[PDB]
Design a protein around this ligand. Structure first.
Ligand SMILES: [Mn+2]
Length: 1436
């Protein structure tokens, strides 16, 4: 035993680095002969060296004596109260800023992220607590995946761990101490960790057997193919016989196009007259809304230089009264600009009324008088301007400042009297034709004004803030009082006469109309040219044009979810109108609640448009009008989707989640990590009730909306599948709350002047009453007591105790190797012996949230990494099972493409195409149903499926978290209803009767199946059920039905037999479809009322197909392109925009909109003072050759259009090179002639090698600004390394941030110093070369670079490498006339990168051409199209 101990002490005696504290640990280490003490001092040595590399790597002072944070601040003299006992690894105190460091090692990813978020939550607790002791805390977590360090070699450490593990093999150690929980925890903690985990005990406590018994209750799952057919035929015959006087006929009808219009016009008859002329509509429209009234009317430099200079100088450092001095300078500039702001809009966009200005000026002059005469004011002005001029000497000067020296020359001889004497002398309805752009231009100006008004800094009569926007030789002013991001009251006014219009909106919703002026008009023109018929010319096109323009402008002027949902129900309605058989309950889901009298006007416009489009004599064509109406809906897709209200949307999504639960009757209250008797009993009872589902054999069978699957149909399905025939200060604020509640009760003379008081008492009550109802945890899954600890981070414990007891009193009136070994060596809590309910660590803890979608708030389920891995295991197991099948279509592009081909082929033969959407696919499904359909299968090649069964059972008992905002709002509502509108909905009564007991926080039920958590299981089940139902229908009527399913929206294709049947017998077809509805409803596959069947359109995955061509679907992609401008480096922003435009042009959207959207994006970049370099965004005025072309191709195209003749010589030399780039002249000579070090001498030698030399004295004269020539642009080394490392707010706020960062410290230099863009512009200013732009791109300028400014980059080298990449990528026609293998190859070429970053024919060249430049789309593209005939003939 002691031989290998002497070998490992010899090993430490050889391979240890010389450290004194490690010689102290070596001194206590080598004197130990006990193996547990050798393991403790050895792992303490290793984790101690981890703390050495952590504290020395992060610069923190090492905590060796296990000093707490209160000990750290206690030794520094910072008095803290009794806080949480946390022992950090390293600490560093710098003034009032403390830095804490904690490090750990984990082998498994779940314990790594788990201890990561546990230590993250503890350091956020210390962050808020020491923030309440006024200390800015900087937490640092150094989590390491390996046991390596900077002290012991790798194989020596592996020999150490294999030596200690070679000491763990003896039995007397584990028999003596360190029992099998800590022994398996230690031995598995030192492992290198998986399907079918088997290191468990599987203590099923008589519960799994009961569920298996309830699953095999009456299901045969063993029948042959002779009883199934007879059973199905008998049941269908009984159903048909019942369909005469019994069942509700499946609620299927037959379209009467005129009746649908007469029902849509009379729909929603709250207050709408069904007689509206176009002229009266326009008259009401141009005077409808105050914003709408602001446009459609009959309206009719030294100051801005000073304003900008003052802003930029005030921003950084100058002082800290300052605003007073700046406003005084503004008044002097205005009074000297006598011969257009009047209220003197000062810095930060604020104005003063010229009255208190004189008063505080008198006060300042009197204070300066007592400092013992107008010259002292001028002297202060020179002091301030001198500080300004030196701060601008730093890097600015007279950079386009246009002679700010006026206040230096004129007022030297000068006066309050002059100022006041200069200040003292200083309908809404119209007819603007709907043919010009003035309306849209005014809308764009107002939208830009709002978006820029969002940028208020908010530091520290009419003292509100103002923004400016100009017009056709006039200058308006927007006024707003409250800053921030919330909806406010805005006022548009002028200075001439009144014109003070007012409204109340939200600024961050008006983004999609900032610079869109020629885009929308072209969309409208295309939509109308789509309707160039031979019948609607009789005075109808102008009405349609006015209607579409009014619709667009009303949508863009008023963003509201109501109009969005209205036009979505409109696309559903038109899909139903064009079809053959629609659902009877359709119009119930098309009517909505509309308010504010604007949505009613929108509905009147839509009704008139539908009447003008779908009147008599339409039988000429139908495709164009259908496409037009679809485009009007996806024109409602223009509205920004940014959750206009958070709390109401969360309440609504939670209500949609919970209503079907209480309708069933299995809502549970918070359990605690265990399994009591009553909940298991009611679980089994409701699982049995889930299977009752009385069929049509009874007298009340077709309930048609109740969840639950019938036992007989499930048994039939399982039997047909197993047979080879289916698929083959606290006290004072609390007393303030109490006295204000007393006021609310009795003292009502002062009605409401306590808004801020209302907020603070609301927050106090919500934090206080929820402090006594902590809804106990004991799981520590990173989110159980956050907000209650934020509110509690500044409060004492006994304080909370006395507050909660006094508030309930006043509320009753109106009515050991455990801890020292955890942090060093072994991991966190690991899965242990689990019951049939949970993993013995939790109970599959999930949490709910809402998702932003243009249609409706989708539900989202989020969980821990452990649960995520369990669900991923179930997911890919069922994914393998489904890939063994073929009918499914979720993610495999091959089968989806096959579905598209089959759909096209079927529609081309004028057959019937059934569409199907399933309502409430989330809640109506159930994991128990999955367990029951799985347990009754065969699946020949077994054992190991019991693990899958218990995993699926873990989902049977799962928990969801109610957000704290919801329960706080419910408590406020209950208090308001108890102290002081009687519309108690089911959820409110549920919350109230729960509050009578204990408040609920966690919910557990049966039929939840959180969306996305079990996606592939749902796909598998839906595939099986759809195939079985189609087989049943083909057996009943002798037909053939194909199906394609995506787990929510499915399509079905009927053969010629069913089409002939529909053409011959409508009654049998209606009976067959009602029987399909009955079958799909017996199993939990409820059909949504939006499902329509017909032979004109096919609805699948938001892609519509008709006979002939396919729907171009323009406006959806147009409005998508107008959106999504985030806060990134504008190169990546242009990448994203070009990708979206490439998808759009892969579609049917006419090219002319590509160029317009790109011009809009370039204008948005121009407005942000960001140099329009050529490599930023693609060329414009594009040819129709967006096919077979990459982004590099379009960059090459714009450079060739930008260079008249040199590109021709470059193309000639490159063709001669590519002819020599073949065998015999391999790239080794070229890669050795790379020469990316000094200059373009490589190309000089290449062109002089085989002919024409380049035209010098003009080639180097062309160069562009690469601002990221040394480092990327920061905002608060090639790209290959970024790809290797990646291998392992609102939308308007993004644009606001983009404009903010591009003005502040953004770019840095080769000296590790930050600077501005205007810094570079003031650095060049000329010096042999001026911008020399061409069509809006400020590019192409240099004379002879050869040491002060290296930000430039020649055009010829970039064009050369990009042309080489484009040529080797695709084709050789581009020179005409108008994953891991790459890593291995980069390791082969780059010698020093082998020890720095390790973790065929032309690949060497393409990877070589990426180390120098970073934006030429190489790595991104390495790892169908519909074009018009005329645009193709326009191609070159
Ligand atoms: Mn659908």
């Amino acid at each position: 035993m002691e031989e290998d101990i002497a070998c490992v002490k010899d090993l430490v005696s050889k391979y240890l680095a010389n450290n004194e504290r490690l010689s102290r640990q070596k001194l206590a280490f080598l004197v130990q002969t006990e193996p547990r003490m050798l393991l403790m001092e050895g792992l303490k040595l290793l984790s101690l060296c981890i703390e050495v590399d952590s504290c020395n790597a992060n610069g923190c002072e090492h905590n060796s004596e296990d000093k707490s944070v209160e000990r750290i601040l206690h030794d520094h003299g910072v008095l803290t109260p009794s806080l949480c006992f946390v022992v950090p690894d390293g600490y560093k105190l710098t003034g009032n800023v403390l830095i804490l460091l904690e490090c750990f090692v984990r082998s498994s990813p779940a314990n790594f992220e788990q201890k990561y978020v546990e230590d993250f939550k503890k350091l956020e607790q210390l962050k808020e607590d020491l923030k309440s002791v006024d200390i800015n805390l900087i937490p640092l977590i150094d989590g390491r995946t390996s046991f390596y360090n900077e002290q012991i070699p790798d194989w020596v450490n592996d020999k150490l761990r294999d030596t200690l593990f070679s000491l763990l093999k003896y039995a007397q150690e584990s028999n003596s101490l360190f029992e099998e929980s800590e022994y398996s925890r230690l031995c598995e903690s030192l492992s290198m960790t998986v399907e079918s985990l088997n290191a468990l005990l599987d203590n099923r406590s008589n519960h799994y057997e009961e569920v298996i018994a309830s699953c095999h209750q009456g299901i045969n799952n063993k029948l042959t193919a002779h009883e199934v057919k007879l059973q199905i035929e008998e049941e269908y015959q009984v159903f048909r016989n019942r369909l005469r006087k019994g069942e509700i006929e499946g609620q299927f009808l037959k379209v009467e196009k005129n009746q649908l219009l007469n029902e849509f016009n009379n729909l929603y008859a709250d207050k709408v007259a069904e007689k509206d002329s176009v002229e009266h509509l326009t008259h009401q429209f141009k005077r409808a809304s105050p914003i709408l009234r602001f446009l459609y009317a009959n309206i009719s430099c030294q100051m801005q230089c000073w304003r900008s200079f003052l802003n930029k100088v005030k921003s950084m450092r100058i002082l800290n009264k300052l605003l007073l001095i700046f406003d005084a300078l503004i008044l002097l500039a205005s009074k000297h600009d006598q011969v257009d702001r009047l209220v003197s809009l000062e810095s930060t966009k604020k104005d003063l009324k010229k009255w208190v200005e004189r008063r505080q000026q008198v006060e300042r002059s009197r204070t300066m008088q007592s400092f013992q005469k107008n010259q002292i004011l001028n002297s202060i002005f020179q002091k301030t301007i001198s500080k300004a001029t030196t701060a601008l000497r730093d890097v600015g000067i007279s950079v386009d400042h246009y002679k700010i020296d006026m206040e230096v020359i004129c007022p030297d001889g000068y006066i309050m009297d002059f100022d006041v004497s200069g200040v003292t002398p200083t309908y809404i309805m119209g007819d603007v034709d709907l043919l010009k752009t003035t309306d849209l231009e005014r809308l764009s100006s107002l939208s830009l004004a709002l978006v820029n008004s969002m940028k208020t800094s908010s530091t520290v009569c009419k003292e509100a803030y103002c923004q400016e926007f100009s017009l056709g030789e006039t200058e308006f002013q927007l006024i707003y009082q409250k800053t921030g991001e919330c909806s406010k009251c805005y006022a548009i006014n002028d200075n001439r006469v009144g014109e003070v219009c007012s409204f109340y909106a939200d600024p961050k919703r008006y983004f999609p109309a900032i610079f869109s002026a020629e885009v929308l008009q072209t969309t409208v023109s295309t939509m109308i040219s789509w309707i160039e018929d031979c019948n609607e010319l009789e005075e109808q096109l102008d009405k349609i044009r006015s209607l579409t323009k009014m619709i667009l402008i009303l949508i863009l002027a008023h963003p509201s979810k109501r109009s969005q949902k209205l036009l979505q129900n409109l696309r559903y309605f038109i899909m139903a109108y064009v079809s053959d058989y629609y659902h009877k309950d359709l119009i119930d889901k098309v009517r909505e609640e509309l308010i504010t009298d604007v949505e009613f006007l929108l509905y009147r416009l839509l009704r008139t448009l539908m009447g003008l489009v779908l009147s008599e004599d339409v039988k000429s064509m139908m495709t164009n009008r259908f496409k037009f109406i679809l485009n009007i809906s996806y024109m409602c897709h223009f509205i920004t989707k940014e959750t206009p209200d958070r709390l109401t949307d969360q309440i609504k999504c939670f209500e949609k989640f919970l209503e079907p639960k209480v309708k069933f009757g299995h809502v549970s209250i918070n359990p605690a990590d265990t399994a009591t008797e009553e909940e298991l009993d009611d679980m089994v009872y409701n699982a049995k009730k889930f299977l009752s589902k009385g069929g049509c054999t009874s007298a009340k069978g077709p309930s048609y909306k109740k969840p639950g699957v019938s036992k007989k149909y499930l048994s039939l399905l399982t039997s047909s599948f197993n047979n080879g025939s289916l698929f083959k200060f606290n006290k004072l604020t609390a007393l303030a709350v109490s006295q204000l509640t007393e006021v609310f009760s009795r003292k009502g003379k002062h009605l409401l002047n306590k808004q801020d008081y209302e907020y603070k008492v609301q927050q106090a009550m919500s934090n206080l009453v929820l402090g006594s109802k902590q809804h106990k945890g004991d799981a520590d899954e990173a989110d159980l007591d956050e907000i209650l600890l934020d509110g509690g981070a500044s409060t004492y414990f006994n304080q909370l105790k006395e507050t909660v007891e006094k508030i309930v009193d006043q509320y009753r009136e109106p009515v050991t190797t455990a801890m020292l070994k955890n942090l060093c060596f072994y991991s966190q809590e690991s899965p242990q012996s689990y019951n049939s309910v949970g993993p013995d660590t939790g109970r599959l803890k999930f949490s709910l949230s809402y998702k932003e979608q243009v249609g409706g708030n989708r539900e989202l389920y989020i969980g821990d990494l452990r649960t995520k891995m369990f669900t991923r295991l179930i997911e890919d197991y069922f994914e393998a099972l489904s890939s063994q099948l073929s009918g499914s279509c979720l993610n495999n592009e091959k089968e989806f493409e096959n579905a598209i081909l089959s759909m096209k082929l079927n529609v081309s033969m004028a057959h019937v195409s059934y569409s199907m959407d399933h309502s409430k696919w989330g809640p109506m499904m159930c994991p128990f149903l999955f367990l029951t359909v799985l347990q009754n299968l065969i699946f020949l090649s077994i054992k190991g499926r019991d693990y899958l069964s218990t995993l699926l059972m873990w989902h049977m008992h799962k928990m969801v978290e109610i957000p704290f905002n919801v329960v706080s709002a419910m408590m406020k509502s209950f208090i308001k209803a108890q102290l002081g509108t009687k519309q108690s909905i089911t959820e409110d009564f549920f919350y109230s009767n729960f509050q009578i007991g204990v408040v609920p926080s966690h919910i557990s039920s049966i039929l939840d199946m959180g969306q996305g958590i079990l996606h592939n299981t749902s796909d598998f089940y839906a595939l099986i059920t759809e195939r079985f139902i189609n087989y049943a229908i083909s057996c009943v009527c002798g037909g053939t039905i194909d199906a394609y399913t995506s787990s929510d929206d499915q399509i079905s294709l009927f053969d010629q037999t069913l089409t002939e049947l529909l053409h011959r017998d409508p009654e049998e077809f209606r009976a067959l479809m009602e029987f399909h509805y009955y079958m799909s409803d017996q199993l939990n596959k409820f059909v949504s009322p939006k499902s329509v069947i017909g032979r004109f359109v096919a609805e699948f995955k938001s892609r519509f197909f008709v006979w002939g061509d396919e729907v171009p679907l323009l406006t959806k992609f147009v409005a998508a392109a107008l959106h999504n401008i985030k806060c990134k480096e504008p190169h990546q922003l242009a990448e994203t925009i070009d990708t979206i435009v490439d998808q759009s042009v892969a579609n049917g959207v006419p090219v002319h909109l590509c160029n317009l959207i790109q011009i809009r994006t370039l204008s948005l970049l121009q407005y942000a003072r960001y140099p329009i370099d050529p490599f930023l965004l693609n060329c414009e005025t594009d040819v129709r050759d967006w096919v077979d072309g990459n982004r590099s191709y379009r960059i090459m195209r714009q450079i060739e259009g930008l260079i008249p003749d040199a590109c021709s010589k470059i193309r000639s030399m490159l063709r001669r090179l590519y002819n020599r780039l073949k065998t015999g002249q391999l790239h080794e000579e070229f890669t050795t002639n790379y020469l990316s070090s000094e200059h373009l001498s490589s190309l000089k030698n290449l062109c002089e090698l085989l002919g024409v030399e380049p035209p010098s004295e003009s080639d180097l004269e062309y160069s562009w600004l690469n601002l990221a020539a040394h480092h990327p642009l920061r905002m608060v080394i090639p790209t290959i390394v970024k790809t290797i490392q990646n291998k392992l707010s609102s939308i308007a706020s993004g644009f606001v941030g983009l404009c903010r960062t591009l003005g502040s410290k953004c770019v840095r230099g080769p000296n590790k110093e930050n600077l501005y863009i205007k810094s570079i512009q003031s650095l060049i200013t000329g010096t042999q070369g001026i911008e020399l732009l061409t069509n809006s791109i400020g590019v192409q300028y240099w004379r002879v670079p050869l040491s002060v400014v290296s930000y430039f980059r020649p055009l010829l080298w970039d064009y050369m490498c990009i042309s080489l990449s484009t040529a080797i990528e695709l084709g050789a026609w581009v020179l005409g006339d108008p994953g891991l293998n790459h890593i291995i190859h980069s390791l082969r070429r780059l010698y020093p990168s082998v020890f720095e970053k390790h973790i065929i024919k032309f690949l060497d060249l393409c990877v070589a051409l990426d180390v120098n430049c970073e934006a030429l789309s190489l790595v991104s593209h390495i790892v169908h199209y519909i074009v018009l005939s005329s645009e193709l003939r326009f191609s070159h």
